[PDB]
Design a protein around this ligand. Sequence first.
Ligand SMILES: NC(=O)C1=CN([C@@H]2O[C@H](COP(=O)(O)OP(=O)(O)OC[C@H]3O[C@@H](n4cnc5c(N)ncnc54)[C@H](OP(=O)(O)O)[C@@H]3O)[C@@H](O)[C@H]2O)C=CC1
Ligand SMILES: NC(=O)C1=CN([C@@H]2O[C@H](COP(=O)(O)OP(=O)(O)OC[C@H]3O[C@@H](n4cnc5c(N)ncnc54)[C@H](OP(=O)(O)O)[C@@H]3O)[C@@H](O)[C@H]2O)C=CC1
Ligand SMILES: NC(=O)C1=CN([C@@H]2O[C@H](COP(=O)(O)OP(=O)(O)OC[C@H]3O[C@@H](n4cnc5c(N)ncnc54)[C@H](OP(=O)(O)O)[C@@H]3O)[C@@H](O)[C@H]2O)C=CC1
Ligand SMILES: NC(=O)C1=CN([C@@H]2O[C@H](COP(=O)(O)OP(=O)(O)OC[C@H]3O[C@@H](n4cnc5c(N)ncnc54)[C@H](OP(=O)(O)O)[C@@H]3O)[C@@H](O)[C@H]2O)C=CC1
Ligand SMILES: C[C@H]1O[C@H](OP(=O)(O)OP(=O)(O)OC[C@H]2O[C@@H](n3cnc4c(=O)[nH]c(N)nc43)[C@H](O)[C@@H]2O)[C@@H](O)[C@@H](O)[C@@H]1O
Ligand SMILES: C[C@H]1O[C@H](OP(=O)(O)OP(=O)(O)OC[C@H]2O[C@@H](n3cnc4c(=O)[nH]c(N)nc43)[C@H](O)[C@@H]2O)[C@@H](O)[C@@H](O)[C@@H]1O
Ligand SMILES: C[C@H]1O[C@H](OP(=O)(O)OP(=O)(O)OC[C@H]2O[C@@H](n3cnc4c(=O)[nH]c(N)nc43)[C@H](O)[C@@H]2O)[C@@H](O)[C@@H](O)[C@@H]1O
Lengths: 313, 336, 334, 333
Amino acid sequence: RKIALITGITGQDGSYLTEFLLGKGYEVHGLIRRSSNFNTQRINHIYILMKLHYADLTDASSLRRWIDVIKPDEVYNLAAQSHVAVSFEIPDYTADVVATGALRLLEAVRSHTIDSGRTVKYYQAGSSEMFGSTPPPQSETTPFHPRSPYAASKCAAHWYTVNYREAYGLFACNGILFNHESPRRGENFVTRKITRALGRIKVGLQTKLFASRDWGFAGDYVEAMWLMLQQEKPDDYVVATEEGHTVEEFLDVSFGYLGLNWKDYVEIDDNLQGDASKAKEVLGWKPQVGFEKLVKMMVDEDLELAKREKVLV
Amino acid sequence: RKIALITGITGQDGSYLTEFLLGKGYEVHGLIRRSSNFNTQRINHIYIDKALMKLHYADLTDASSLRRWIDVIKPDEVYNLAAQSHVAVSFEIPDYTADVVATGALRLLEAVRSHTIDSGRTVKYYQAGSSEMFGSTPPPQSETTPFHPRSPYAASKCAAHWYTVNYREAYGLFACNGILFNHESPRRGENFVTRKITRALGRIKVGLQTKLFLGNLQASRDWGFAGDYVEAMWLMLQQEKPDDYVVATEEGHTVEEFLDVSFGYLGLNWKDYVEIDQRYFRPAEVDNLQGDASKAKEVLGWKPQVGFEKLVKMMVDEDLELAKREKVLVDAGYMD
Amino acid sequence: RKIALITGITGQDGSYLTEFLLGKGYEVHGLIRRSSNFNTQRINHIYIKALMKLHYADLTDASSLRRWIDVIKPDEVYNLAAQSHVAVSFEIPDYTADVVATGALRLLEAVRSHTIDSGRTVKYYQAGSSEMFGSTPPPQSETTPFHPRSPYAASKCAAHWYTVNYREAYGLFACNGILFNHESPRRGENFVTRKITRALGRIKVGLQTKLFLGNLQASRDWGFAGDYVEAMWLMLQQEKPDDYVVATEEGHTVEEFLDVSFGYLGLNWKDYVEIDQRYFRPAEVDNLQGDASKAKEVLGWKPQVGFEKLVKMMVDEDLELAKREKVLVDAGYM
Amino acid sequence: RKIALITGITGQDGSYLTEFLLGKGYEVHGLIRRSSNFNTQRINHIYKALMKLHYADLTDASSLRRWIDVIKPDEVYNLAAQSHVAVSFEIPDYTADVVATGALRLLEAVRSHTIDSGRTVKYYQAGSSEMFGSTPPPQSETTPFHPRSPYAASKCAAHWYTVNYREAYGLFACNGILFNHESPRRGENFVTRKITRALGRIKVGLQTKLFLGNLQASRDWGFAGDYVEAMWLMLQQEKPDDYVVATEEGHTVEEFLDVSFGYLGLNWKDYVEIDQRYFRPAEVDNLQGDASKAKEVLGWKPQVGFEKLVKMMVDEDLELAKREKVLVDAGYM
Ligand SMILES: NC(=O)C1=CN([C@@H]2O[C@H](COP(=O)(O)OP(=O)(O)OC[C@H]3O[C@@H](n4cnc5c(N)ncnc54)[C@H](OP(=O)(O)O)[C@@H]3O)[C@@H](O)[C@H]2O)C=CC1
Ligand SMILES: NC(=O)C1=CN([C@@H]2O[C@H](COP(=O)(O)OP(=O)(O)OC[C@H]3O[C@@H](n4cnc5c(N)ncnc54)[C@H](OP(=O)(O)O)[C@@H]3O)[C@@H](O)[C@H]2O)C=CC1
Ligand SMILES: NC(=O)C1=CN([C@@H]2O[C@H](COP(=O)(O)OP(=O)(O)OC[C@H]3O[C@@H](n4cnc5c(N)ncnc54)[C@H](OP(=O)(O)O)[C@@H]3O)[C@@H](O)[C@H]2O)C=CC1
Ligand SMILES: NC(=O)C1=CN([C@@H]2O[C@H](COP(=O)(O)OP(=O)(O)OC[C@H]3O[C@@H](n4cnc5c(N)ncnc54)[C@H](OP(=O)(O)O)[C@@H]3O)[C@@H](O)[C@H]2O)C=CC1
Ligand SMILES: C[C@H]1O[C@H](OP(=O)(O)OP(=O)(O)OC[C@H]2O[C@@H](n3cnc4c(=O)[nH]c(N)nc43)[C@H](O)[C@@H]2O)[C@@H](O)[C@@H](O)[C@@H]1O
Ligand SMILES: C[C@H]1O[C@H](OP(=O)(O)OP(=O)(O)OC[C@H]2O[C@@H](n3cnc4c(=O)[nH]c(N)nc43)[C@H](O)[C@@H]2O)[C@@H](O)[C@@H](O)[C@@H]1O
Ligand SMILES: C[C@H]1O[C@H](OP(=O)(O)OP(=O)(O)OC[C@H]2O[C@@H](n3cnc4c(=O)[nH]c(N)nc43)[C@H](O)[C@@H]2O)[C@@H](O)[C@@H](O)[C@@H]1O
């Protein structure tokens, strides 16, 4: 039975990757941060073959400890302070987690394989944010011009990973993923912010609702992560839908799906075009969920959520 | 108007202290951690009532984030409540715990000192001390009772205690150490024994749960009400001179007695649901904690208003309502 | 009187830059690490009243950085501090990244926090390295893409971007000096050039017999640290902040270095050199040669010391150093 | 062949412990920090294949565990630290991360090692009398701690992390609560070496003034060469414990001045001037240990007494000063 270790398992991607690997018969171990409040909202339904362990990317000891006890076959580093805006607020912390944290995991894995003679496949959660202002089309080889501490930190993590591959021959893959959403997307993100409101509005619990992007479904993307680690050789891959859409187009589809006009609730207050050819060719990966289905999917779940709220009220 | 800066505002004590200070007319500022999930459940109702309560992103392991907000806020009082506060968890992540509970407290102290000197302002500081620092030292424990920490968390609290005392003695910083004993409430973290019990009890009463797993039932603790204790933190900073005070009810009870009172209050025999699992036992345990709050009573005039029985019943009532709320969702087919 | 704060002042570049700035009438402050041993060998002479002040701090300690920035209120900041050895970076990657990458960010953030809190204005220099280009083919210029081959290199790439991000995001006057290999008689003895000349001078006096090296094929663009520190200062004297490659636009291999140095003393390096695998890096950087057209045209900077002169300048020093040692050893002083 | 891993091997104690263990037939490994300058001045004369140096840092957990796995040491001596008390007030955060958390990282790396490999390791923590702070003497193992500096509070923390790993996991970890100990290898920024180093230069005419701070502070001074032996002894017992290592004799900085200068026929009052900058924000007034337990259980006792220690340091620094004068009048420096 293959064993997988996931950092950032409580996040959006972690929650889906967990379900995916389980369906694959994998034994899944995830590292979680201690917090004063419930923090396993995305994987609660799963917990009730999945083990959770306390750890932190800023604590190298905690990382090596669990890798030694778990002896994973595949390690997915999805953990990070993933909010771009917030990264300007806590740059040091973000760098320590996103950049150095990644290096700690890499070094913990390399050290482990040398001490135990074992083999480990590694995945680094890269981001299209690394490209920054570089003009399209952005592929695996496009140069980075990060525009935030978060992006710069991901660039560093990307390079530490590549370095461990070329220097030690570690099976380390960099998934350069573009924006992906889902019903579990953090509410601090535009797509989820919108669908959350709509559900509330429809239920009548809410009154008002406060650069284009390549949005894909988180469920599809984690599959590409797994595919990367199943190839013969380690490599870096861009994962995107290669299509664009606007927040308004999102509003129309979202609100239109529930028979509401967005102009009755809307309250007015970069340029990434990825080439995922390599992913399609080498991994045979293809998004099986389009923009429309993704939106209506988010809307349905957020409505079910609003109703749960109306019932309580 | 008085400006207060609270670290660990999202926690149990932080939520109560916030309500208490706002009640005193304070302008409250709190530092929070970015999380992939909702993390302001305890203070949401206050924030939604940006004005008198602002929240800022920071981390006790990031010294820059601390100094930055101290400079921006120019607080009059600083309450360091932030911490990886679970004892059992500290054995699993000692390094992270130490960096936050020990060095983290030092980072704040040093950020406050640098601020007051660079800007000439004055700040009163409060450090969230714990009875856990006494460790195995026999009760009753007072301000003069020696420490003998039994976990990485406790040893880190002692360090934070000494860093604080040092900044007071070395720089004249008005810094106080609140040596608080266990204090609970309906907002207590669910992974702590008292909350874990009343939460499970409430579910059992409504048929949503049937078995409750616990560890050492013979451990004895001095349990007060967090609502009462946050007042003591405030009092400490109002005195003429800084000092350290033990805050407790001076009444001790075992976990088993907590079970008797809680379950018995709802007409059930906990022995019918409770089961023991070695996984909840800790490498090094703290057997008996009971404080002597004579100094707080005499100097701060502080006295706990909520007693043990009332606290237990308060938590049971709240968690029962919670369980019923969940029961309604299951009944309506909204919850699985 | 301008005030400059130099991190990594005890290092090679730090010592030269300090002299250069003092010669310009600057008040120089340096941040130094506490150590159980003497660690100011390169700057101790700068004393022989106090235009050079040293303060205890560390790039892994954000508070220590902001602390001296507030007290010093500098006009210019030069971040030269770093775990600068590439081979060592493969051994202690975590620490290296924390000093070279996050450490640079801590300084940047401390400077920005300082300017916003005091309304003051500060100019900032980041010590970038040609090592960032890694395996990318030469000649490498400011537009050449990076492909780091070591944790150190990757970390310098991070610092580069953090620096660029602060300039673009907050309008901070921050420049990236993309300096290529630069040696001097003060160069660390664990780097190839100094290792060679030091061993040479000693071999020449009978103090040493065998010199162990790694990859002699490695080609590099070697300049003189004394010349390069001037470019750092010029960069900050411009109207607008930018990034510049500082090099000699001439590459030579380590063997060529070995030919010139030993031959200069009429010796045949092949008679004393041996190859040890331990000195090979897990991932190597083959050829580095810069394109400093931008520095010349904009800063008006040009390297005064050529390769030959550099090698002979280093050999002369270490030879005289080896001779003095021999005298002290012969006299029973060492 | 016994294997020892020493953190802080380049420091005073590390250099003596290395010699002591090598003389005991040990294979010694030491962790050193990468630096821009030569940093092995104290152990160069040793480094002919039983002493290995590896790059690491107490603020880098990975680096620690890494070498512990490769080396698989039987005994670990944690002497690594930002050991200057005055400096600790200026860089409290770093000092804490190294002295307190750094000690915890090593303990956790050793525990993780022994659990993952099944091997056994004996651990020594370099505790200090500074932990007692202002608590009045005599100070023994159980005397309450009242740290007066970030350094001391960090040592107090390291002390408890160490005791906790012993009580919680049964790890063989001992806390050596050592009082001040000097030697000709002592750091020049410490009062004793500062004084003897200056005295020597004054005697040969290379220096004229010596600036100091509080001369009334009282300390229990022993010889590092003697103390490192107590460290080894603690780990040779059947059970782990904590022991105070001291001379039990206290003296003031002034007495140190009378003895050292008087030894060369000089009056220190003619060269010493008080500088307010050398005073610590919070001072440690009087330290005198009770090393009964060490003598009774370890059979350990100091060989070098106060005056002998002072004269030892003065002799070396005088000869060093004379040798400098010669190199000065020659153009070598
Ligand atoms: N989603 C996207 O569109 C894009 C995301 N990515 C990246 O892919 C990864 C997954 O994204 P996503 O699921 O949306 O992110 P989320 O923000 O939903 O989840 C982040 C996860 O990281 C954990 N984490 C944060 N800090 C630490 C720490 N110090 N130690 C350990 N764990 C920590 C979080 O824990 P906790 O719950 O406690 O906060 C959470 O589990 C991230 O690295 C993200 O940057 C890449 C491209 C785009
Ligand atoms: N409660 C008790 O009975 C006793 C507790 N204490 C101490 O008093 C304080 C308050 O207790 P309590 O409210 O119950 O504790 P909680 O665990 O409920 O709250 C801890 C708080 O600290 C925050 N925090 C944790 N790590 C960090 C970090 N690295 N940076 C910033 N913030 C962080 C938490 O944030 P987040 O929500 O994201 O996790 C939360 O706000 C704590 O220090 C605790 O150890 C002392 C004696 C008694
Ligand atoms: N010289 C070259 O050929 C090239 C160098 N560079 C870079 O330019 C800078 C200067 O180079 P160079 O003078 O030769 O390097 P050195 O290695 O000689 O000097 C490094 C300096 O950084 C200090 N330092 C290291 N770690 C820390 C820390 N954690 N906190 C504070 N200070 C620290 C060192 O202190 P300590 O003495 O205590 O060790 C020393 O002062 C470095 O960043 C280097 O990487 C760029 C291109 C080429
Ligand atoms: N000496 C005394 O009188 C007393 C001292 N002690 C303690 O005993 C120990 C030995 O003392 P002593 O020899 O005099 O101290 P020194 O200051 O001479 O030596 C300290 C050692 O620790 C190393 N070190 C410092 N920081 C780090 C770090 N971050 N990572 C790795 N290594 C590091 C130093 O390296 P580097 O050379 O690079 O600086 C040096 O090898 C110390 O822990 C000290 O605090 C306790 C009681 C008494
Ligand atoms: C004062 C102190 O109170 C709390 O620290 P404590 O360790 O005293 O609180 P906790 O409620 O966790 O445990 C109290 C005692 O009950 C035992 N116990 C029995 N079964 C269980 C169980 O299943 N879970 C937990 N968590 N504890 C259990 C414990 O072993 C212990 O003996 C925290 O809030 C600290 O942060 C704070 O400093
Ligand atoms: C520009 C770059 O220069 C320096 O980094 P570098 O790695 O370019 O310089 P170094 O002198 O270490 O090596 C140059 C080339 O020669 C090879 N070499 C062969 N044998 C040896 C040997 O024994 N020791 C060393 N140190 N190098 C050896 C190296 O492998 C490499 O190919 C540092 O100052 C960096 O901080 C800076 O960023
Ligand atoms: C035991 C303890 O000893 C040492 O810590 P200490 O602080 O005891 O050593 P130090 O020699 O620095 O000071 C001893 C006492 O003399 C006073 N003193 C007077 N003038 C001066 C002066 O100019 N410099 C210094 N450094 N000290 C001066 C000090 O204030 C103090 O009262 C370190 O080795 C620690 O790491 C170790 O833990």
